[PDB]
Every structure is written in structure tokens, then in C-alpha cells.
Amino acid sequence: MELKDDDFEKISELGAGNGGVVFKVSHKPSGLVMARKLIHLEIKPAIRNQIIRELQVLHECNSPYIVGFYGAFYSDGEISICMEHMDGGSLDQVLKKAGRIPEQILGKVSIAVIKGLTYLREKHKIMHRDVKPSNILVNSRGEIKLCDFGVSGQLIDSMANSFVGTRSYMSPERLQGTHYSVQSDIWSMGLSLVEMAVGRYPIPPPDAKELELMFPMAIFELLDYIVNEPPPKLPSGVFSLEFQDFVNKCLIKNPAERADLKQLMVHAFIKRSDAEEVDFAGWLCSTIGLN
Amino acid sequence: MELKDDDFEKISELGAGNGGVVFKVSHKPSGLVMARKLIHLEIKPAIRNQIIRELQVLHECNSPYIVGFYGAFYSDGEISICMEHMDGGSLDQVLKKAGRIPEQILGKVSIAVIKGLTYLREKHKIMHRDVKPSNILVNSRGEIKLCDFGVSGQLIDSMANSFVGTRSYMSPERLQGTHYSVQSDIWSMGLSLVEMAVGRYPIPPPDAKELELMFPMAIFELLDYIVNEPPPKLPSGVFSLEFQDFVNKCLIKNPAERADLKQLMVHAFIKRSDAEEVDFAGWLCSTIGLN
Ligand SMILES: Nc1ncnc2c1ncn2[C@@H]1O[C@H](COP(=O)(O)OP(=O)(O)O)[C@@H](O)[C@H]1O
Ligand SMILES: Nc1ncnc2c1ncn2[C@@H]1O[C@H](COP(=O)(O)OP(=O)(O)O)[C@@H](O)[C@H]1O
Ligand SMILES: NC(=O)c1c(Nc2ccc(I)cc2F)cc(F)cc1OCC[C@@H](O)CO
Numbered sequence A, B: 001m002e003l004k005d006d007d008f009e010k011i012s013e014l015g016a017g018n019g020g021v022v023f024k025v026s027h028k029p030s031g032l033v034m035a036r037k038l039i040h041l042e043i044k045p046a047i048r049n050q051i052i053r054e055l056q057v058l059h060e061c062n063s064p065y066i067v068g069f070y071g072a073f074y075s076d077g078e079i080s081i082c083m084e085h086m087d088g089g090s091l092d093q094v095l096k097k098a099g100r101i102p103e104q105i106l107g108k109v110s111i112a113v114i115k116g117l118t119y120l121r122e123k124h125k126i127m128h129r130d131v132k133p134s135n136i137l138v139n140s141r142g143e144i145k146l147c148d149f150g151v152s153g154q155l156i157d158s159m160a161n162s163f164v165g166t167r168s169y170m171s172p173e174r175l176q177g178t179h180y181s182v183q184s185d186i187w188s189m190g191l192s193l194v195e196m197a198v199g200r201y202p203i204p205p206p207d208a209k210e211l212e213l214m215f216p217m218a219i220f221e222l223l224d225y226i227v228n229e230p231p232p233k234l235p236s237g238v239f240s241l242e243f244q245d246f247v248n249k250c251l252i253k254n255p256a257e258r259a260d261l262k263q264l265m266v267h268a269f270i271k272r273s274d275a276e277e278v279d280f281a282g283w284l285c286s287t288i289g290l291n
């Protein structure tokens, strides 16, 4: 059935980035609890139907690695995208309370992301455009899912400004021009993994004294680092050699040299992670206390 | 009297940046129309009183070049700052409908800004930290006023992320580290003036063919320009030699070499503008249609 503004009821606020706030809501007619993202866009009515219209392909975005879509509509200056509520939140949140995420777990995470990106590529011909820990969502059934991918050309445009937060996951080629594409998602994924593995955003990399503890930076400074200095890497010793190479292949500067989804899929790390018997569901609650 | 949440009534939305929306509101008990800025901040209660407390010095910020302050309070996840409603909007808005702002007018603008920055310096020991066309506000009485200056240390911190919009007014030294201070406001002012004088954000500068018509860029690309390439400048011929030097002295890269408020105050351009008989009030409406 169609989703309409007054059919919803606010339960709590799930958080905010810039551009959007997201609420936990009850769809009164179905009883379903969902997550409603609201984007305040001061834009003409012609284009705002094109956005709604371009968001409808999300109805055909069915994968266990992609957040579910319920519907999209316009009301009171804001676009509403209504999604499956992920009760585990985003990996940036679980990182905060975890402190650090084990290699084992990041194994299962890496698989979801690669498979998610692959689904979007093959079935829908789109790149993500914003892979970072807060666009990777988890739940109590142990699912790991992507959202906030760039389905709508016109939405991408109307929101065009981006991310100055003292931290950026954009690939060097994306930071330097328009000559970029899907390979860029691999860079972002690689950098997210190193962050989650290490406990902190990994630039500048931990100086010798700072990696001891294992039991800010200005805008131009940070960007210059990304584009001009050698990429981040896992510390040796405490992570497996296969994981180290895996992230190493993700964080190669030259996007044509960088590994692509085809190659990461059949990587030793993924093959080793896929076999492993990991109770993610159990670990997720043990750390964030959902039960 | 004290300002409280339920004493207000929404009239219209004056716009949004990121971090805040600002509404045109009626303070029901006084009848006063004011502008209410709302900042959504997910922050502990101890610090949020420090913010309110640090915003109270705005009660002593009385200058004809500074937006008036009515009060500040916390309600429902958001800090509210209530200001004098400037019915002319911001100079970024008047630029859009003006197309271009005359030299004469920018004369009167430059004076307000310098005098505003000077007031904040001498009487309050603060730098602005965000001089750009949308933090310069005008009204039907012909007033030109600054707001959104950094009065509250703790607010500055809690909002710490900034400006990625394909356009930045931060000085080179501010983009490259923490070694910056009040001189940085001069850079921002100089760049705002060149924008308003020219009709478009002035980086990259107009190539020979593009300055003919007088009757985008990636993040790192833009920043690298600011810090590493020679600064923007007025085109010759269509602006006075005194204005040209004035902006030239504002946009010097080295912050110790850059002109300071003391020097711009007694600059030929300012002395020439101060004498001039300009009906700003009249021009403002002639262009935006307020009457
Ligand atoms: N479908 C969802 N289910 C549960 N939580 C969500 C969902 N979508 C978003 N969130 C939460 O909302 C927060 C803010 O989302 P968003 O507006 O996209 O900002 P950002 O991703 O930049 O933090 C996310 O960090 C996440 O915690
Ligand atoms: N006191 C005010 N009176 C009238 N309009 C205002 C006032 N303060 C802000 N505005 C309007 O609100 C808009 C958005 O303000 P803000 O949240 O500071 O975002 P930004 O300054 O980044 O555009 C401004 O561009 C201006 O048009
Ligand atoms: N940011 C979004 O939420 C977003 C978006 N949202 C979105 C997509 C799928 C699902 I399931 C849930 C969602 F909410 C859909 C778009 F088509 C473009 C978007 O954002 C575009 C800007 C980014 O590229 C960089 O910030």
C-alpha cells in the first residue's frame, strides 16, 4: 500500500547526519516499525517528483545485504524514505561501544559489503558513492546491510555538497576530480575496515608510541595526506597476513591497479572468512546489550 | 523577560544551512517578530548549560553592525538562538537576485563588516570565524549587520565539522592548521567582496573568455587552489583602482603581511566610500522588491 505522511507515528530519533534526520516510526495502518529518513530540500515540484520516481527502483532492491525499502514520498519540505529498521544500528555506533571490532567479525562484514556492492553493480548498474561505517547497518538476526547508496541521479545532485567532518572516506581520485567510478567504493571499504579494525579513523597513521596501547587534523592537511602520502595499513603482528593483504589491495592509490569486486570475492581472506563459524548475532548483543 | 519554547509561534522558514534551520517566528507575549535559529545537538546536559551560559554575552553585543540578540534556551534536542529578524535576508540571497552588487554598495558593506569585526575584537575579544555573504544580513532600514560569529567556545567545539559545499571562504592558514587567528577574518571578507563584486564564487578565476560576459571543482582541487595558487583579484577596468588595491590587501596569503582592521579602516577605498551619498535602503528594495 502507499505510504502517506499522516499515517506515521514518531517513536524516537535514530540520529542525524547533515542533510537528513532519521526517526524510528510506527506505520499505523500496518503496525510495522520502520526507520524514516527525512531530507530537507528547498527544490521546485517538477524535479521533486523525479526524485520520488527515481527512488521507486528501490522497490526492486531485494538482497539480504541491502536494507529493505518500504516507500518514498514528499511532505512539508522533505523527502521521506522509509526503510527496514535495523535494530543494531550502524557500524560506527557499534564501533564506539566495541572499542574495536575483531578480525573474525570484520570477515563477515567484508563479505556483506562486497556482496552488497556486487548486487548493486550487476542487478542495478549503480555504485554506492558513500561506503563508510555509518552506512553499514546490523541487526539482532545477525544481518549486515548497506544503505544510503546513490540510486537517484537527481537526489545526488540536489544534495551536492558532501563531507567536511574532520574525517573523509573519499578515494584519492574522487578527491581530485570527476575521473572516478566503482573502484572508488573499494577504497572507501578498505579504509572503513582499517578504521573498525583499529578503533580510530586511521589518518594520520598511529605513530610508533600510539600502537603500543593495544590490549586534530585540518581540512587541507587531511586531504593532502589522502592524496599525496602513502596509504594506511594494518599494523603487523596482531592481524592475520591474509587480512593485511586484503586491505592492502583495497587501499592502492591508483584505481586501475586497486583490486575490484571480482578479485576480492575470491581473495584468501574472504575464502577463509566464509568457512568460519562465527556467531555474529551473539557477539553483536554481547557488546551493545540488545537482550 | 525570559524566552521559553511554547511562547513562540512559527510564521515561515527563513532557510537552512547544515547544523541549523532558521524560522521567522512571533514571540506571542511581546508581539515581536523574530528569527529563531535551531541547532540540533546530541549532547550531555552539563555542557549544554555552558553553551546557553556562554551565549548570554550576546546580551551585551550592542552595535549597529551586529545582529540583535533576544535570548537563548534549550528545548527538545535543540539550542535556540533568537535574533532580530533582518527582513532583507543575507547578502548571498541579495546577490542571487541582484546578479552582481555595485562597487558603491560594496563600499557601504565593507564599512559595516570592518566596523562589526572591530566591535567584536575591541569590546569582546573574539574573532568571527565564518565571514561569508550569508552571515552578512541586511534590512529595509538600510542596516548591514553580522551574525553567526563565534561567541561560545563550547558551541564552536560541539558543532566542529564545517563547510564542504563546493565553495570555501577559509583562509590558507586556516585550511592548513591551527596557526591562525583574527587575520583570517580579513581573508574571508576579501574573498566575499570579490564574489559579490563579480557575481560568482571567484575560484577558479574567470578565464579570458568568461570575463567577456559583463554588461564544477572537486574538494581537493579547490582547496589546493586556495593554498597553493595565486589569490583571486578583481578584473581591471570595470572596478576602481582603490577598490582593487583594497581587496588585494585583504587577499594576501601570508597572514602577517595581510592588511588588518586598523589599516583597512583608514584605506583610500573606505575613506572614499564613507563620504559617498548612497541610498542603500532604496537600492535594496529596487532589487529584491520588499515594498
Ligand atoms: N534503516 C535504519 N535503521 C536503523 N538506524 C538507522 C537507519 N538509517 C539510519 N540509521 C541511523 O541514523 C543515523 C544517521 O543517519 P544519516 O542521516 O544517514 O547520517 P550519517 O549516515 O551521516 O550518520 C545513522 O548513523 C544510523 O545510526
Ligand atoms: N536573523 C536573521 N534574519 C533573517 N534571516 C536570517 C537570519 N538568520 C539567518 N537567516 C537566513 O537563514 C539562512 C540560513 O541560516 P544558517 O542556518 O546560518 O545557514 P547559512 O548561514 O549556512 O546559510 C541564511 O542564509 C539567511 O538567509
Ligand atoms: N544519502 C542518502 O541517503 C541517499 C539515498 N538514500 C537511501 C538509499 C537507499 C536506502 I535502502 C535508504 C536510503 F536512505 C539515496 C540516494 F539516491 C542518494 C542519497 O544520498 C546522496 C548523497 C551521497 O551520495 C553522499 O552524501
Ligand SMILES: NC(=O)c1c(Nc2ccc(I)cc2F)cc(F)cc1OCC[C@@H](O)CO
Binding pocket: B037, B058, B066, B067, B068, B069, B081, B083, B129, B130, B146, B147, B148, B149, B150, B151, B152, B153, B155, B156, B159, B162
Ligand atoms: N554558527 C552559528 O550560528 C554560531 C553562533 N550563532 C549566532 C551568533 C550570534 C548571533 I547575533 C546569532 C547567531 F545565530 C554562535 C556561536 F558561538 C557559534 C556559531 O557557530 C559556530 C560554527 C562556525 O564557527 C562555523 O560554522
Ligand SMILES: [Mg+2]
Binding pocket: A017, A134, A135, A148
Ligand atoms: Mg547514512
Ligand SMILES: [Mg+2]
Binding pocket: B017, B134, B135, B148
Ligand atoms: Mg549563517
